[PDB]
Enzyme design. Sequence first.
Site, PDB file in Angstrom:
ATOM      1  N   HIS A  72      13.278 -34.385  -3.706  1.00  0.00           N
ATOM      2  CA  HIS A  72      12.457 -34.279  -4.958  1.00  0.00           C
ATOM      3  C   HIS A  72      12.188 -35.668  -5.556  1.00  0.00           C
ATOM      4  O   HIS A  72      11.040 -36.021  -5.810  1.00  0.00           O
ATOM      5  CB  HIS A  72      13.193 -33.421  -5.992  1.00  0.00           C
ATOM      6  CG  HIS A  72      13.230 -31.989  -5.539  1.00  0.00           C
ATOM      7  ND1 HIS A  72      12.115 -31.169  -5.595  1.00  0.00           N
ATOM      8  CD2 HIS A  72      14.243 -31.211  -5.039  1.00  0.00           C
ATOM      9  CE1 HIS A  72      12.483 -29.954  -5.141  1.00  0.00           C
ATOM     10  NE2 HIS A  72      13.771 -29.926  -4.789  1.00  0.00           N
ATOM     11  N   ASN A 111     -14.233 -21.700   4.362  1.00  0.00           N
ATOM     12  CA  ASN A 111     -13.395 -20.505   4.336  1.00  0.00           C
ATOM     13  C   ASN A 111     -14.300 -19.295   4.434  1.00  0.00           C
ATOM     14  O   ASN A 111     -14.122 -18.421   5.313  1.00  0.00           O
ATOM     15  CB  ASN A 111     -12.575 -20.428   3.068  1.00  0.00           C
ATOM     16  CG  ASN A 111     -13.420 -20.300   1.836  1.00  0.00           C
ATOM     17  OD1 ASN A 111     -14.098 -21.267   1.380  1.00  0.00           O
ATOM     18  ND2 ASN A 111     -13.389 -19.118   1.260  1.00  0.00           N
ATOM     19  N   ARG A 144     -10.752 -13.357   5.854  1.00  0.00           N
ATOM     20  CA  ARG A 144      -9.800 -14.406   5.541  1.00  0.00           C
ATOM     21  C   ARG A 144      -8.439 -13.864   5.210  1.00  0.00           C
ATOM     22  O   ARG A 144      -7.451 -14.569   5.329  1.00  0.00           O
ATOM     23  CB  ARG A 144     -10.308 -15.208   4.366  1.00  0.00           C
ATOM     24  CG  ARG A 144      -9.698 -16.586   4.278  1.00  0.00           C
ATOM     25  CD  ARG A 144      -8.471 -16.514   3.407  1.00  0.00           C
ATOM     26  NE  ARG A 144      -7.312 -17.279   3.882  1.00  0.00           N
ATOM     27  CZ  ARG A 144      -6.102 -17.152   3.351  1.00  0.00           C
ATOM     28  NH1 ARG A 144      -5.937 -16.314   2.329  1.00  0.00           N
ATOM     29  NH2 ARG A 144      -5.077 -17.880   3.783  1.00  0.00           N
ATOM     30  N   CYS A 172     -15.607 -28.405   0.488  1.00  0.00           N
ATOM     31  CA  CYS A 172     -14.407 -28.009  -0.224  1.00  0.00           C
ATOM     32  C   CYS A 172     -13.627 -26.926   0.475  1.00  0.00           C
ATOM     33  O   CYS A 172     -12.512 -26.613   0.086  1.00  0.00           O
ATOM     34  CB  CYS A 172     -14.728 -27.570  -1.655  1.00  0.00           C
ATOM     35  SG  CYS A 172     -13.296 -27.340  -2.631  1.00  0.00           S
TER      36      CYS A 172
END
EC number: 2.7.3.9
Lengths: 573, 573
Positions: free
Chosen positions: A189, A454, A465, A502
């Site tokens: 982390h 997509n 999808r 995108c």
Amino acid sequence: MISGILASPGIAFGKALLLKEDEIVIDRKKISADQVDQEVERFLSGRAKASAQLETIKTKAGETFGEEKEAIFEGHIMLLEDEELEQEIIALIKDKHMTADAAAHEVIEGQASALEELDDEYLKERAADVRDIGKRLLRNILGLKIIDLSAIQDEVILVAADLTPSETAQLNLKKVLGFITDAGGRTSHTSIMARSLELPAIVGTGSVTSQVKNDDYLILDAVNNQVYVNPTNEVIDKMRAVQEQVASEKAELAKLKDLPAITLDGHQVEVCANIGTVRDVEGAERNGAEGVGLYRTEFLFMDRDALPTEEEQFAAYKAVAEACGSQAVIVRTMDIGGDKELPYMNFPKEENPFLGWRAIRIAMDRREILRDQLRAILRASAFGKLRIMFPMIISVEEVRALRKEIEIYKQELRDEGKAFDESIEIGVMVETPAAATIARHLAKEVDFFSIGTNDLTQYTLAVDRGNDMISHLYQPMSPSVLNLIKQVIDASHAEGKWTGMCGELAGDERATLLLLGMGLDEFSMSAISIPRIKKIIRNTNFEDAKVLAEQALAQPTTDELMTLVNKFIEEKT
Amino acid sequence: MISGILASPGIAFGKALLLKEDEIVIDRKKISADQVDQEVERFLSGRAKASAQLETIKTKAGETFGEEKEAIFEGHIMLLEDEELEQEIIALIKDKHMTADAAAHEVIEGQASALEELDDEYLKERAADVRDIGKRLLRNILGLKIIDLSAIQDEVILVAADLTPSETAQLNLKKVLGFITDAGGRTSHTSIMARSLELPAIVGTGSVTSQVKNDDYLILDAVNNQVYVNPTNEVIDKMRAVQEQVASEKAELAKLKDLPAITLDGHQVEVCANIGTVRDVEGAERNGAEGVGLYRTEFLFMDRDALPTEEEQFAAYKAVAEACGSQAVIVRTMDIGGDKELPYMNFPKEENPFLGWRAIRIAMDRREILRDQLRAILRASAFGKLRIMFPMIISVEEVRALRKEIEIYKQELRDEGKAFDESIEIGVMVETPAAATIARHLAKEVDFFSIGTNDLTQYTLAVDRGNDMISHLYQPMSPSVLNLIKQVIDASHAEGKWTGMCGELAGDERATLLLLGMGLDEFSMSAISIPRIKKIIRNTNFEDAKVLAEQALAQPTTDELMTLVNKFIEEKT
């Protein structure tokens, strides 16, 4: 000769702080019945402290880092107060007559132990956060002295074997000139914070803390990956000059298009974040985004339990525009209705949501929605560079009807004495095979394109999808989708516009050379993918990629196209 | 100078038969209570006859025409025995003390009267069939003498004001040399039979029966649209020569490929029926189909309550192959899983069936299905010209895997001493935008293509074929779908193969010139559309259509492309 993994490049000079922790002693001495009631009270009394002390740490995280870190403490605190722990901790003491520190350790260790049995590195780290809660609980019952990293009055470097998320919140960023630890690596982390904070730091030192004492003067090269302990001025000097170079590097990179998104041979692309919410701007800035390539406005709509009015949208958009500073946001009008319903709309069910009444098909059947929103976007454009983009476009008909709509909403604003960027650019998602097919026609009608792979994949291959049963057929890296991508990019360029992307392909390491070679202008992705892709871009030669792309576009088979990509990666870096 | 609509062209010479029917008298005289019980018995006794006599007509329809006409009588008989009629007919007689012929007339007239209130010509005709059932019932109670068209011992021409479906079944086709009536027009059931039977006949005479007496000698030109009554030999001669031309016309058309599916300027296409079941072969032959362009094998699977084995499939295929005579059938392997589930498979639900586990995606995940079927097709090809075609193709990968499959199944057959046409041609549905995109690649790998525009439209536009809410966006006549059509056809031709079309566009009057101009080789449709399209084809000039097609393909808008089509139709026929 000590070397670590170097999580952030830079240089620093300061004193070394060493976090020393004593081993926790556990008494395995069985307790008597009369001690059963007393041990429970000690646990409750000891638990009473950590309850209030843990709450104090939470408030510091909210003010120091924000709500992103504030809620993590609530989960840890809420888990600690879980009614299952109260009954299980008390039952063992009452049933097994065990001690509170030994009995409580088994309960938290028991659950964390079950998580370790998991065969996933992501689930194992969370087990580390859960383990930390029980580890401190033992100190809280005993009342062990706490160092607290907030008691720092002088600037110092932070050195430790490993830091737990709890320390990172109550940590003084301004008084810590860097972070050095021997943890596992980036999977730690604290290591991620050095990247986002952009401060020099090492996490794989291996054994530096055993070589450093508190108050030691150390110089961090974070460039030659070396540490100087009590070194003369000849090294304090070299380093100081190394630090100069580092600072000049910033100054040069600081330029506009002079960003890492440039191939070896000089070809630049934009690389941006897709976002859902102002809150995502943080990740975008963290990961080196040069702007926002897709602002899925749906997500803002699912961030609420009512439809956001013009005014709420405006505010939300304004915030984003402003949280993005100089940067451009591509605000997509709303896309509800495939796998993204908003329940509050109570729309009726469809046999194939993904081929149904989705996105623009709604806003056109219910103008109040389209109008409020476009109104809001325009008005928000008075406050930062925004673009408008439309989802699920299928025809030139649709685009003209919506531009006409914009023009109406533009005038109304003009008439109500409400500024909007008159320059505002309008584009369309190309994420339908229709759009892809009439890309030439659409390119005259818009300022730009962003390819939604997509969806495009989905419709071109007719594979849902969402459907895992046929996921193996969902291939955005098909000769069919790539060709349609090329055809769109080319459309753009033929009109002197540009195409961005995108869809998740933009962020996919395996398409990056092809997307590049095919001339894609803009990539937009999950912020987390920005560096991988940037890296690939910065290390390619653009001309070579073109050749690659071209080859790939002629393959009748994915495998054959994967081969090209691979031989490239072999031969070319 | 008498002219009708001429439903079938040809010539005939014979005596004229006249169907005379007396008016049905209805007594409005109220009946006493003692007569209530007697009137019901008369109705039951009169109904008892029609019950047995109607059944006799049914058996004649089954042997004479087939099961297609046999079941229509069962509906009429089943409707007559409806328990609602028994209670309603008896209630009025018992409650209103009305007569059985007057009370029964109100019940059947009452329902038929409600149907007429409908604003549809299709529902109104069915109301005519229901009205006929009650009309004869009144004669059955009275016991009126019946002429019966089956009592014909000599060849004669049939003349009547109008014929009801019931007469067409018990009609002697061999003793009737033609049919002449003054009904409304083609919307008349008997009129359709003349077309399918291919026998000369008129239905719009208007008033010929009032000018003809039984035993009159008449000559039907069905070419000059004139009727000669007791004409000398000079006309009996001209006609006889007209009949010669008619017979030569057949002889020439008989050829093979040189049929009506030829534009004015000599361009030929195939025009075929899509079918579901041997039973559809009848409609195909009726409507002038030159072969079968798509044998949706699913439909055979939904014709049963179990999955049909290799053997059942084979038989079913064999029958079709044979019911098609010389003609080629394009047998598509099975396409279950969008809007066409077969319940007996109990497949699990999907979020988007139309983007789901459909057609080939199943047969490849369950080879027994693919294997049985391909096995069956191949074996059936030993019995008539069959082709194999695959649905839902998306990649070159899929095609190669399935050809490889064929080759395996071919050998097995060879090894089991089972003939199959070694020439058997294999093609693919192009009904995915993927397929359309890689059409060039696929064209090397198959013998042919048939474009499924129902699906292609669906995925290219992402509009669910089932979804009425967005139906307005379902446009196979988009610049986007047309372009993809062109691109596929061209792929075909570039490899020297051909593309057909079984999507509904093939059958759509508005695409016919474009489909033609774009070079589509083959059209396959509902049989009922074959003549409309044939007509359009036969009356176009092919060169003009090319020009049309080309223009249309450049339009960025459907409307603009509709305009071209329209100005064409205006200027060009």
